Amino acid sequence: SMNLNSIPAFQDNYIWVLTNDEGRCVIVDPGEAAPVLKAIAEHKWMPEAIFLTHHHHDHVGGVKELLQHFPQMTVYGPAETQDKGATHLVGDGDTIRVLGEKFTLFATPGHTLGHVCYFSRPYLFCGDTLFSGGCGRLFEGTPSQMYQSLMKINSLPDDTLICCAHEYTLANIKFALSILPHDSFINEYYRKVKELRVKKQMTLPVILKNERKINLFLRTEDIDLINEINKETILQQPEARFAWLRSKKDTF
Ligand SMILES: [Fe+3]
Ligand SMILES: [Fe+3]
């Protein structure tokens, strides 16, 4: 049984921390060490590991210093984080025992080529692959890769807690409303998210069952979304419509 905490970092990052009953924690994508060190001290956590989802600085920046403080830790990460301090390279389909729990790794290329997600039901650490109401910008991968990646995530159980790295939800939903302005779910979510954000409260994590109702990038096969896209371009291939939506989001 694990409990979830978050530590804000930089401007809109969250460093997720999962802790077991023994107070042992895994720290996910620590872009900044200081807030994590402070949190560890506050919670009297005993760090066991860091999970890295991808190589971006806002996810890995704090690794070296955290390792300096807690040399007992293993830093799990994909090959693309090997030079960012990963001490245990993880690949697609790997299972690892952390905090006494089993985490499944799956590759979710798109945002970066080597991006991975960590899943230990219900927790999904999906870094910058999926955001609430959105998905990672495709810095390295193709729309096809991200689409595949999103389908992998979407295949997870309804109760999956989406613990993505960024407070992008409000902007994501504003984008969503530019596509389906009258969508009941998205509008409801916009309302909820606006109130959280105005109160300076985080919008994460979110439950996948709900997330897929409001995330256009998880609604590629939704009739309503298809009908909307059809108003401007006819794209039979889901990857193409996902790509279209992603392109729209790129410039929104
Ligand atoms: Fe990133
Ligand atoms: Fe990021």
From Swiss-Prot:
GO molecular function per UniProt: hydroxyacylglutathione hydrolase activity; metal ion binding
Reactions catalysed: an S-(2-hydroxyacyl)glutathione + H2O = a 2-hydroxy carboxylate + glutathione + H(+)
Positions contributing to a divalent metal cation 1 binding: 54, 56, 111, 128
The protein's Enzyme Commission number: 3.1.2.6
UniProt KW Metal-binding keyword: yes
Family annotation (SUPFAM superfamilies): Metallo-hydrolase/oxidoreductase (SSF56281)
InterPro entries assigned to the protein according to its UniProt record, in alphabetical order: Clx_II_MBL, Glyoxalase_II_hydrolase, HAGH_C, Hydroxyacylglutathione_Hdrlase, Metallo-B-lactamas, RibonucZ/Hydroxyglut_hydro
Cofactor: Fe(2+); Zn(2+); Mn(2+)
BP-aspect Gene Ontology terms: methylglyoxal catabolic process to D-lactate via S-lactoyl-glutathione
PANTHER family named among the record's database cross-references: HYDROXYACYLGLUTATHIONE HYDROLASE, HYDROXYACYLGLUTATHIONE HYDROLASE GLOB
Function according to Swiss-Prot or TrEMBL: Thiolesterase that catalyzes the hydrolysis of S-D-lactoyl-glutathione to form glutathione and D-lactic acid.
Full protein name: Hydroxyacylglutathione hydrolase
Gene that encodes it: gloB
